[PDB]
């Protein structure tokens, strides 16, 4: 996998690939690596698929119970912490999970990185998975706070493409999300095969590749 997420002026972008591997064999061409915890909360998935699905869906149960007890939505900070504490229970037992908890709350947009070690980091921009290095390259050189929703969606989409191309264990398709104060908005599934040729022509990039 390759996942990314970043905060900006108009909320937070979340982009992920869809490939799944079992060794060198591509077990899946299209797997959902985002979980809709609630209308204002998202969670990315990298590492063991089973671990990512089980624990983040269990987080959603616990985030839902929060709303019922308190009559109010859980913060991104609190949600990320519940998940990190879950990881801390199975400390050294062999879980493999890297996720970004993305959402909008009273403090504005929120983004937290969380992994199997229990690490929990707040930040503007994150990227996880085998192809995170390729994504960071595009992100770091093109990121601004002053990005438009249209340009930001493209940046996250283009950054996954960069990774899908170079990283053998990343690809398939790109799933896009945009989180606002009215909730997250799904911006579709984009095949990398088709997206690559399109971007190559329109952008002029990937000159070395023949098409």
């Amino acid at each position: 996998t390759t996942t990314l997420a970043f905060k900006f002026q108009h909320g937070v972008i979340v982009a992920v690939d869809s490939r799944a591997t079992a060794g060198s064999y591509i077990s899946s061409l299209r797997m959902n690596k985002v979980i809709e915890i609630n209308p204002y909360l998202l969670g990315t998935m990298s590492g063991c698929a089973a671990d990512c699905q089980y624990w983040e869906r269990l987080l959603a149960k616990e985030c839902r119970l929060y709303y019922l007890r308190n009559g109010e939505r859980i913060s991104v900070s609190a949600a990320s912490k519940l998940l990190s504490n879950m990881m801390l229970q199975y400390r050294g037992m062999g879980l493999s999970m890297g996720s970004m908890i993305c959402g909008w709350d009273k403090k504005g947009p929120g983004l937290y990185y969380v992994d199997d070690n229990g690490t929990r980091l707040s930040g503007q921009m994150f990227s996880t998975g085998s192809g995170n290095t390729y994504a960071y390259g595009v992100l770091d050189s093109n990121y601004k706070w002053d990005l438009s929703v249209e340009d930001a969606l493209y940046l996250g989409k283009r950054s996954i493409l960069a990774a899908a191309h170079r990283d053998a264990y990343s690809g398939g398709s790109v799933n896009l999300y945009h989180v606002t104060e009215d909730g997250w908005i799904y911006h579709g599934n984009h095949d990398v095969g088709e997206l690559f040729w399109k971007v190559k022509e329109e952008e002029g990039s990937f000159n070395n590749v023949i098409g």
Binding site: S27, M31, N32, C48, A49, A50, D51, Q53, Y54, M93
Partner: protein
């Protein structure tokens, strides 16, 4: 040292139609270079119009199926004989598999049936419980042989329309149950030729709104 796991071979295949679904699997059971049985059923009718197959280590596969069948029974008791939907069964199975996260069921599991809108459904699992709904999935020994064939012949991958030369794709027309069964048989005949653990027999379970039907076909016994 005692190895609690084993490999009983076999291969399974699930395909979701427009208003039907199939779950096929060979009937050969093996250890190493020996055949245990030429006909040992691997795909099961679990009730509520759901079919299931746990391929890999037979002992864990039989245990999982047995527990899911049991989960269906108690779902009826606890919820006033309500029908267990295919999506609900899938999520239930995830929790069954993850209950042994640190001593896994060594099986690749597939279930097939119909969703609540009457359309065909296939769900695929890994040994630790990650799942997702799919249209097409081969699992087990010859999975890597069969899947590329299904990408080509079911989803028309890398197939374009003549004359356009790569500009226009082959449109994704739906397949009938008769067409699917042909692809299933050719998949297993091809897998039998080039995979030593595949052969003897092929058993297919077809699910429609009318119920669950079975079909059996001989395979090469060498």
């Amino acid at each position: 040292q005692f190895n609690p796991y084993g490999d009983n071979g076999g291969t399974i295949l699930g395909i979701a139609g427009e208003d039907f679904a199939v779950l096929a699997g060979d009937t050969r059971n093996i250890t190493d270079y020996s055949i245990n049985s030429r006909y040992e059923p691997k795909v099961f009718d679990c009730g509520d119009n759901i079919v299931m197959s746990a391929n890999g280590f037979a002992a864990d596969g039989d245990a999982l199926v047995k527990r899911f069948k049991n989960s269906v029974k108690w779902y009826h008791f606890d919820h006033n004989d309500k029908k267990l939907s295919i999506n609900s069964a899938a999520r239930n199975i995830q929790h069954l598999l993850y209950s042994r996260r640190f001593f896994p069921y060594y099986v690749y599991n597939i279930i097939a049936g119909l969703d609540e809108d009457g359309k065909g459904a296939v769900y695929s699992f890994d040994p630790v419980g990650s799942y997702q709904r799919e249209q097409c999935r081969a699992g087990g020994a010859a999975a890597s042989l069969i899947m590329p064939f299904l990408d080509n012949q079911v989803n028309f991958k890398n197939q374009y329309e003549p004359g356009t030369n790569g500009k226009v794709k082959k449109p994704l027309k739906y397949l009938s149950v008769e067409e699917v069964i042909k692809l299933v048989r050719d998949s297993f005949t091809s897998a039998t030729e080039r995979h030593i653990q595949v052969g003897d027999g092929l058993e297919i379970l077809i699910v429609t709104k009318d119920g669950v039907r079975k079909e059996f076909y001989e395979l090469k016994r060498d």
